[PDB]
């Protein structure tokens, strides 16, 4: 559960705070890196 797969080898760092009749709309794009 908490650990998704067996191994998880990455060194990225990007934290923020909560992104939390309850319509939660999201749009995902990937452009210009």
């Amino acid at each position: 559960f908490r650990v998704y797969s067996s191994a998880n080898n990455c060194t990225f760092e990007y934290v923020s705070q909560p992104f939390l009749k309850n319509l939660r709309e999201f749009v995902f794009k990937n452009i210009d890196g």
């Binding site: 060194t11 990225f12 760092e13 990007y14």
Partner: protein
């Protein structure tokens, strides 16, 4: 503390506001050499890793 040579550590700095002004860390350096980049122009250039 620090570490040994056979097990030298490697720290990845990839997400930071770099205050390259670590010249306060014992300014009387015994060896301050630069390869591929000049000493001060270093502070105003971008890099990935």
């Amino acid at each position: 503390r620090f570490a040994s040579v056979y097990a030298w550590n490697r720290k990845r700095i990839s997400n930071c506001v770099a205050d390259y002004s670590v010249l306060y860390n014992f300014a009387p350096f015994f060896a301050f050499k630069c390869y591929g980049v000049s000493p001060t122009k270093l502070n105003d250039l971008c890099f990935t890793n």
